[PDB]
């Protein structure tokens, strides 16, 4: 029922290789709809979903100049953070930025986000109150102070509670058949003998959306978490997701193990046995 829009930015310095690499992507729930690549020839915001390409040139021109502004902004951050950590010019470093908004079942504002990362580590993050910042190290304390004096959280809160959710509601309406759908997972179970006394029972979940799903193995009602091989939800390439969980079952006890699937598309949670 709840929905969310997310923008992800990744800036990677390329020492001795020219300008830094900038890649920006946009997501509505688990569906990507826009992209930008600093190495691409178009140098424009490009559609990545069938429901967003219909937007006129005013939309794409506005998104293009803004994502190019973010590219220039992050390029300055690469030098600013280098000076904060007293680093050289030959080192390749990565800056990551994510912000967006979440809405509830009533499509009303729920949560806002705006956080940064440097070389895979948390740097600065807007707290839930949308008025304070969490700075990990001392270098991020400098950024928090500059953002406090410039009142960056005030303008960000206006965007997260306004423009973000207003267009998060707008994309949901234009892509109702794509974003407002709920595809129940197609489930099936697989059996393979590893020896004459052990067999692997694999529970499959296919063609479901959103990606949030839970596959658990139970033996007579007891959770087999430590013995369950559970892969992360993976994209199929068509807008749907996949996931499976496997357990090693001694030959003859297949009737003792059950698979449980929970997803928004299912009217009731499923219980799967090999029978």
């Amino acid at each position: 029922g709840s929905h969310s829009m997310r923008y992800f930015f990744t800036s990677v310095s390329r020492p001795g290789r020219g300008e830094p690499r900038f890649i920006a992507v946009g997501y509505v729930d688990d569906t990507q709809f826009v992209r930008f690549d600093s190495d691409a020839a178009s140098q424009r915001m490009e559609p990545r979903a069938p429901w967003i390409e219909q937007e006129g040139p005013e939309y794409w021109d506005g998104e293009t100049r803004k994502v190019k502004a973010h590219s220039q902004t992050h390029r300055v951050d690469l030098g600013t953070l280098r000076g904060y950590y007293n680093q050289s010019e030959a080192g390749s470093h990565t800056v990551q930025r994510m912000y967006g908004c979440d809405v509830g079942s009533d499509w009303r504002f729920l949560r806002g986000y705006h956080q940064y990362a440097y070389d895979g580590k948390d740097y600065i993050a807007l707290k839930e109150d949308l008025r304070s910042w969490t700075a990990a190290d001392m270098a991020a304390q400098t950024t928090k102070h500059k953002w406090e004096a410039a009142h960056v959280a005030e303008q960000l809160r206006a965007y997260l509670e306004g423009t973000c959710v207003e267009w998060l509601r707008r994309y949901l309406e234009n892509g109702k058949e794509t974003l407002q759908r709920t595809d129940a997972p197609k489930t099936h179970m697989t059996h393979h003998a590893v020896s004459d006394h052990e067999a692997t029972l694999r529970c499959w979940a296919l063609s479901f959306y959103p990606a949030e799903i839970t596959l658990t193995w139970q033996r007579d009602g007891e959770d087999q978490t430590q013995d369950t091989e559970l892969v992360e939800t993976r994209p199929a390439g068509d807008g749907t997701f996949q996931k499976w969980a496997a357990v090693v079952v001694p030959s003859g006890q297949e009737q003792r193990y059950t698979c449980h699937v929970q997803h928004e598309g299912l009217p009731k949670p499923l219980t799967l046995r090999w029978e």
Binding site: A69, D77, Y99, Y159
Partner: peptide, 9 residues
């Protein structure tokens, strides 16, 4: 839609 504020670290 993206944000238009130029937020610098």
């Amino acid at each position: 839609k993206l944000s238009h504020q130029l937020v610098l670290l």
